[PDB]
Ligand binder design. Sequence first.
Ligand SMILES: [Ca+2]
Ligand SMILES: [Ca+2]
Ligand SMILES: [Ca+2]
Ligand SMILES: [Ca+2]
Ligand SMILES: [Ca+2]
Ligand SMILES: [Ca+2]
Lengths: 217, 217
Amino acid sequence: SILATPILIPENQRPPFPRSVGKVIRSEGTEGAKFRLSGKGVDQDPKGIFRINEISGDVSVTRPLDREAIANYQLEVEVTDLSGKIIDGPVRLDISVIDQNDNRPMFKEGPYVGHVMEGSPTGTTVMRMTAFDADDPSTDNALLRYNILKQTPTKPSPNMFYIDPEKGDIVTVVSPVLLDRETMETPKYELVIEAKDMGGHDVGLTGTATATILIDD
Amino acid sequence: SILATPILIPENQRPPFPRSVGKVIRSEGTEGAKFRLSGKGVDQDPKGIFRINEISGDVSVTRPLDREAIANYQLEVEVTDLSGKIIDGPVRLDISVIDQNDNRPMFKEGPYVGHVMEGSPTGTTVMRMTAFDADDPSTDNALLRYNILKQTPTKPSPNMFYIDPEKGDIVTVVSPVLLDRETMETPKYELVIEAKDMGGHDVGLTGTATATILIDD
Ligand SMILES: [Ca+2]
Ligand SMILES: [Ca+2]
Ligand SMILES: [Ca+2]
Ligand SMILES: [Ca+2]
Ligand SMILES: [Ca+2]
Ligand SMILES: [Ca+2]
């Protein structure tokens, strides 16, 4: 009878506030009855972000929210007497904050340096390079896809390596007969690694980091 | 008797599908009685996207949603006898789709030319340039801020203009002196304009146009 629904709310809502977000329905209900709300977000830190209209059962939010700060609130609603005795025992009101894409992919282990053998077979792992993302990992908003943007130098061949778009594993793609040194200038290679958002998708957010790769004897 | 409260779903959800997005509660009705959903999205183009469990009244979606394709669904839900005849007349089930920042700002008014008289004062509106954004202007996903990225040439000053972050207005910032022809080459400055999402915060997506500004006699 007290009855009402799990509210979803996008983070980073623009002003003004407060804004309606849901509505607790009762029915079987006296006159001079009052919806009262409580729990985390009302009267437990963070106090004061959610409000119910005591007549209409309109649940409203009073300010913008941050999913990577707080991802869920569990509130409790109830109706009351003219006095304050509960004429409709308390039920749970769940609020899920919806991920918005407001974090940029960023590498956090740098500087990045891996070594590899001069004359290695294809698919030999140089190193691993995973990026971090403060957004929801179960949404496109985290979900990373990796690419190599630049190789220096561009000899013997322009792209000697290739990264796992999924795992971020750098591996060798070039034979022993060129992937060597003998008459080499700098022992090493310089790779510009990009991690992008929304799993590839033309329109992601990016983070970079240049890996330094040393050819070994 | 059927209570069907508005359902929110974020676009670009990730599989596996189907995924539960809501629930229609009724009250006051026999057994064997079955829920039945209908409308565009169900049994009318674009068909096949939402289902309802005929016993529990759980509402589910079968695949990722695109807000820019469809932003709202107008559905109808009813309870029927094993027969087929309504026993709990129809109600509306409104489904809304939460915007996710997946469209990049772009300048669709190529090309951009303005004019400004040689020896103008600080403040002269030369022109305005505004970018379009396929996302929801009520959110931050649209909500663009403006910036001048580069300017060629650089004489007299490397930055002769300023652009208003919100309004997109290009104003002159160079004297009745350091803003004059004759001492020059061709009538023109070329600027790179950037529009940024999320109200100009670093997590914004960006589009760019070139605005040619001619200096007049
Ligand atoms: Ca956040
Ligand atoms: Ca992200
Ligand atoms: Ca987020
Ligand atoms: Ca979309
Ligand atoms: Ca956008
Ligand atoms: Ca969108």
